[PDB]
Amino acid sequence: GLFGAIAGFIEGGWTGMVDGWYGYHHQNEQGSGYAADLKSTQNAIDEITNKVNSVIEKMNTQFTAVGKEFNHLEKRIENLNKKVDDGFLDIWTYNAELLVLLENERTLDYHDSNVKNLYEKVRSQLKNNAKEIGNGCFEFYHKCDNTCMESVKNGTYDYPKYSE
């Protein structure tokens, strides 16, 4: 979207991956399968959770009793009171509505970013040892086994293995 990753060059999501928000789908000789990223998904959850908690926790209100009583000869201050109620009604309705619109845009861009960054951390790690498909998928040139995929997920990837 804003980072090009989600709904961008990576068209869709995987109903197959249920371990986390972002992950991988390997395809070697030992088999296939989906595997979500440990570290990446954890940070997102921790940070998104803190986000929801911030929008909530920062709202601590005063003990007040809205609502007042006025007799037939106090219509003015009754309408004053009504104005102060309607005023707060408009300020909070508008702010809340826009707060959700704004933060929903940012949250979606936040996930888009995390995917882009995940893609980039792997790409700048397999310069020659693999090629860009364009679908967010990389095609190896040397053979890559299970212990090989590990060095990519763990970020501990040896690159002195340039083959063809």
């Binding site: 995987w14 003990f63 009604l89 959700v100 704004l102 929903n104 979606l108 190896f140 990519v152």
Partner: protein, 321 residues
């Protein structure tokens, strides 16, 4: 041999809105808006509300014969009053600073009702047994307020009365009284026997001299006369003095009272229950930590801000595909 990178997805249909795009499906989302109440009137702190039932505030403190309800609560967090409660000032008249009295009674920390001027020993020179009316029926028979006494002449004689009470309680004392205005100068003398009378009430702060206004008012509850109601708060140690040559509806019961400001009065048919809540609305209580609510604008306690919104769904996951 390949290693791909992607993101989560599922059966979720939760939709949210963004500044840029509307109705976007997401994997996970929470709701910031509270739109659910328990449909009960609960306790506001640890203390339960004062429910007046078929009566309103006026009928409650004056002692309307019908208003024998919740005899003696020591305290309440707020006052509940049904929209169908009409039993108040049964004898047509004006309740001075009525709304103000309600606000100051809305929440009380201690509240004991004591007999300020005992009926038997306080009025030896006046009749304290004929003061009844058809406007205040108790079982078809003519009655009157329980907390007030309608003093009339004792057989062709109404001597200047002069009683006074000194606040020996450790708190403010709410004292209520009434001034009666007969319809005709004939009723005036028939009731007090002096044609030109006056009533004076006074404390260290309060002072006012009432003059009976004799005239024919339109009939309300069979009454062409009127009876105005007055109240005052007597400071601890201070004394209040009553003096009259007629037309004075004297206090029989008063109220030792300690008020804690910052509450209100709910008018609702909603049932009262034995439950805890931090926020109360006429439609029911709100047990939520969310910042916003669209249940009711009128609220009592530490409540979420009232919003006009129908849904405030905050996305937490990512797009769903």
């Amino acid at each position: 041999d390949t290693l791909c990178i992607g993101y989560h997805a599922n059966n979720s249909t939760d939709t949210v809105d963004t500044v840029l795009e509307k109705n976007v499906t997401v994997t996970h989302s929470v709701n910031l808006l509270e739109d659910k109440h328990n449909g009960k009137l609960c306790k506001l702190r640890g203390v339960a509300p004062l429910h007046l039932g078929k009566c309103n505030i006026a009928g409650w403190i004056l002692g309307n014969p019908e208003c024998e309800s919740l005899s003696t609560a020591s305290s309440w967090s707020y006052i509940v009053e049904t929209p169908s409660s009409d039993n108040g000032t049964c004898y047509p008249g004006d309740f001075i600073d009525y709304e103000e009295l309600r606000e100051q009674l809305s929440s009380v920390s201690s509240f004991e009702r004591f007999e300020i001027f005992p009926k038997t020993s306080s009025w030896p020179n006046h009749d304290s047994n004929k003061g009844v009316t058809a406007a205040c029926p108790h079982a078809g028979a003519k009655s009157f307020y329980k907390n007030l006494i309608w003093l009339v002449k004792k057989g062709n004689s109404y001597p200047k009365l002069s009683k006074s009470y000194i606040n020996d309680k450790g708190k403010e004392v709410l004292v209520l009284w009434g001034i009666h205005h007969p319809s005709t100068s004939a009723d005036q003398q028939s009731l007090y026997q002096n044609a030109d009378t006056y009533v004076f009430v006074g404390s260290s702060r309060y002072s006012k001299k009432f003059k009976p206004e004799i005239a024919i008012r339109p009939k309300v509850r069979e009454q062409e006369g009127r009876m105005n109601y007055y109240w005052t708060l007597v400071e601890p140690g201070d004394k209040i003095t009553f003096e009259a040559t007629g037309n004075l509806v004297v206090p029989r019961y008063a109220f030792a009272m300690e008020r804690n400001a910052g509450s209100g009065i709910i008018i609702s048919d909603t049932p009262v229950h034995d439950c805890n809540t931090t926020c109360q609305t006429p439609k029911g209580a709100i047990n939520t930590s969310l910042p916003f609510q669209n249940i009711h604008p009128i609220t009592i306690g530490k409540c979420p801000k009232y919003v006009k919104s129908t849904k405030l769904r905050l996305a937490t996951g990512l797009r769903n595909i």
